Amino acid sequence: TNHNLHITEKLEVLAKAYSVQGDKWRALGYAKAINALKSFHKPVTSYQEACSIPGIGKRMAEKIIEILESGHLRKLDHISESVPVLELFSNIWGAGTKTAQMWYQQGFRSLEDIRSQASLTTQQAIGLKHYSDFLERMPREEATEIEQTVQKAAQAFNSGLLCVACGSYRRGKATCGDVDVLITHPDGRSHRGIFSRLLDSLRQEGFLTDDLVSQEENGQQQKYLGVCRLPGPGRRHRRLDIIVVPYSEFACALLYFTGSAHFNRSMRALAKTKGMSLSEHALSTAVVRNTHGCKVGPGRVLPTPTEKDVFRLLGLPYREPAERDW
Numbered sequence: 001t002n003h004n005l006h007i008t009e010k011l012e013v014l015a016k017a018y019s020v021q022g023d024k025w026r027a028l029g030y031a032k033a034i035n036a037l038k039s040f041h042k043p044v045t046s047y048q049e050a051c052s053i054p055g056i057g058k059r060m061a062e063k064i065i066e067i068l069e070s071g072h073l074r075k076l077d078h079i080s081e082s083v084p085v086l087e088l089f090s091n092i093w094g095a096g097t098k099t100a101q102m103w104y105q106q107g108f109r110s111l112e113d114i115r116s117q118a119s120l121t122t123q124q125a126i127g128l129k130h131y132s133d134f135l136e137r138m139p140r141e142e143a144t145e146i147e148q149t150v151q152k153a154a155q156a157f158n159s160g161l162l163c164v165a166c167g168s169y170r171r172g173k174a175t176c177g178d179v180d181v182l183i184t185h186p187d188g189r190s191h192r193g194i195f196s197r198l199l200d201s202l203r204q205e206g207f208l209t210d211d212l213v214s215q216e217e218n219g220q221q222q223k224y225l226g227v228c229r230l231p232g233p234g235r236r237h238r239r240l241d242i243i244v245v246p247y248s249e250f251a252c253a254l255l256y257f258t259g260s261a262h263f264n265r266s267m268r269a270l271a272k273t274k275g276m277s278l279s280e281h282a283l284s285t286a287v288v289r290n291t292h293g294c295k296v297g298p299g300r301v302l303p304t305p306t307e308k309d310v311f312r313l314l315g316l317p318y319r320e321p322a323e324r325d326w
Helices: 005-020 024-038 047-051 058-070 079-090 097-107 111-117 124-127 131-135 138-155 194-205 247-258 261-273 307-314
Strands: 162-164 180-186 215-218 221-228 237-246 276-278 283-285 296-297
Touching: 005 024, 005 058, 005 079, 024 058, 024 131, 047 058, 047 261, 058 097, 079 097, 111 124, 124 131, 131 237, 138 162, 138 180, 138 194, 138 237, 162 247, 180 194, 180 247, 194 221, 247 261, 247 276, 247 307, 261 276
Parallel strands: 180 237
Antiparallel strands: 162 180, 215 221, 221 237, 276 283
């Protein structure tokens, strides 16, 4: 008998819907995930437990949780009618499963309905423009070419400027959903002002299309969200993120942006038990509290020059990005 009826029931609908859409590969991944779930003694309610199954990989575990976390209301319609549409809207950039139900709830079933009859975020409007391109994964070597382009344009301004690609790429995975490029300079002074100049040069050359998304400010860190396309025929749009950080925050920014999501989550948990807190900016000691829990002193920031220094302070043996997949 089947224990995980709450997951497979909605996975069967997703698998069927994807085969119809032509994505035969994903439909296979779901079918193999469905089989692994049925052949399990207990119901899965966690990410790690879902991931700790022979048939289920990392990307699949995230989808199960997303499905599991979505849940309710779930009042609307039926899974056969609702789930394929909810998945359809969810894959749009800048859209969540809750946002999807909102549109779905209003009475929207297709992207054209969203294109016209729905209020669009500036980020969401870009999503529809490059929907098919954003929906697919990119080869590793294409991401390698994206890292190189950003690097060459950035190194034009400053010779000592350093660009390192992160995310799925740095972990050595074969395919990447998006590309996150981290930029810094050894002295820690040069990196400033480069962020604005670099985007312009790339935008001028045609590498960046649909340029803007809020450019965000996180203290010293400067992040650009945008889409990019390589020169040449047969090229499709891809998401790019360019982050410029100082050299002091570089070690912790590297660790955070490299991933994985569950890895970082475990690192924060590990840091918390040792009286430290790991942010993307720096590794600092936890906020000092008395016995009763009253905050009596602020935590101080620890010097982490290299990525290895973070591991040593946490008393954890070094793990290379390939072993950070989790």
